[PDB]
Amino acid sequence: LSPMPQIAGVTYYGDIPKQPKRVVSLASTYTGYLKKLDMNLVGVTSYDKKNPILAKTVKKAKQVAATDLEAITTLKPDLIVVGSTEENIKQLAEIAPVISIEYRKRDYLQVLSDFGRIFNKEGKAKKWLKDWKTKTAAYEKEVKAVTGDKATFTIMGLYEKDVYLFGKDWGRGGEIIHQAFHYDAPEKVKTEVFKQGYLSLSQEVLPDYIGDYVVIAAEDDKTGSALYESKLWQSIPAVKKHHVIKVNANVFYFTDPLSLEYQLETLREAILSS
Ligand SMILES: O=C1CCC(=O)N(O)CCCCCNC(=O)CCC(=O)N(O)CCCCCN1
Ligand SMILES: O=C1CCC(=O)N(O)CCCCCNC(=O)CCC(=O)N(O)CCCCCN1
Ligand SMILES: [Fe+3]
Q1: Is 159 in the pocket of ligand 2 (CB under 6 A)?
Q2: Ligand 2: does its nearest atom lie under 6 Å from the Cβ of 46?
Q3: Alpha carbons 219 and 259: distance in angstroms, whole number
Q4: Which residues contact 41 (CB under 8 A, 6 or more apart)?
Q5: Residue 241 C-alpha to ligand 1 middle, in angstroms?
Q6: Do 84 and 144 share a domain, yes or no?
Q7: What positions does the entry give for Zn(2+) 10 binding (predicted)?
Q8: Domain coverage including residue 234
Q9: Within 6 Å (CB) of ligand 1, which residues are found?
């Protein structure tokens, strides 16, 4: 059995195997952490299949939702990984031992070392973390050399007609921009977004939450269109000065090592280019 260490946000159901061989991930937040720890994923989520970075490493995995109990059963998992919002752990636990993670209890870096502790891969985890911290601190200097040290960044995501602001730990590049590069945010973003993590926003207050730079995540090119054509949007200094970094949500939603590596290089190149 796994030693099953007690970790904030981690709940074990059943007897976690010490070396899982057939993992079903039902939480795209964590799939790429498992991948990075060279675990064999035999089921993954829609989001994971849509992630152009991660998808390449899980081609053999079946796409499964939590609602596909029969499909999951057929995969013969020895471990199922879920987010704590999953409402039917009860039936999942009847199929295989389940690990449930409550989002945000541990940070984007701790999550990896935590899995290291659970699954006997603290070596592989600690190597990645050390190199990550090195590379990021270097890149931070490079990017701040261009923008200045006090440049403000806002993280933004578009979905359908919805507009969200994000903080430092709700994906969309906020972990890299706000944590790894230690960029400040506009005042209203800090006081209204950072603690909660995200904020649904009226389009017409947007200028008040954007300073020097803005990172905007979206799943396709069309979703922006009409906002990007608006006078209000076009009146925003950061937009006028081409300080808008448009990124692909299908990878930028996540904070796993694989997604992050790509995000890190993408964001660095974008800022240097400005
Ligand atoms: O649990 C839900 C909604 C359940 C649902 O029906 N989904 O579709 C969510 C799928 C998320 C896709 C991966 N994105 C990230 O990990 C980035 C952060 C984020 O945005 N989250 O949602 C983190 C999950 C926990 C936050 C609370 N919200
Ligand atoms: O909206 C949902 C489910 C989808 C979700 O959460 N995803 O991450 C999926 C991809 C983005 C979908 C567009 N929706 C947003 O961007 C909303 C901000 C967000 O994502 N939260 O997690 C805030 C927490 C609570 C929100 C209520 N639950
Ligand atoms: Fe979300």
Answers
A1: yes
A2: no
A3: 15
A4: 23, 24, 25, 31, 34, 35, 58, 61
A5: 32
A6: no
A7: 243
A8: 132-273
A9: 28-29, 47, 83, 85, 103, 170-171, 253-254
87 is in an annotated binding site: yes
User: Whole-angstrom Cα distance, residue 214 to residue 237?
Assistant: 11
Tally of structural domains, the chain: 2
Locate the DSSP E strands across 145-253: 153-159, 162-166, 198-200, 213-218, 244-248
> Among candidates 243, 47, 255, which has minimal Cα distance to 154?
243
Token duo for residue 97: 């031992």
Instruction: Render the burial of 33-47: b for 16+ CB within 10 Å, e for the rest.
Output: bbbbbebebbbbbeb
Atom of ligand 1 nearest to the CA of 198: 20
Residue ending a domain, among 121, 143, 168, is: 121
Q: After which residues are there C–N gaps above 2.5 Å in the chain?
A: none
Regarding the beta carbon of 43 and ligand 2, being less than 6 Å apart is answered: no
The secondary structure of 255-271 as a DSSP string is: -SHHHHHHHHHHHHHHH
Residues 50 and 180 in one domain: no
Residue 134 CA to ligand 2 center (angstroms) comes to 31
How close is the Cα of 126 to the center of ligand 2, in Å? 30
Experimental technique behind these coordinates? X-ray
H/E run at residue 134:
helix 122-147
Is 182 one of the annotated binding-site residues? Answer: yes
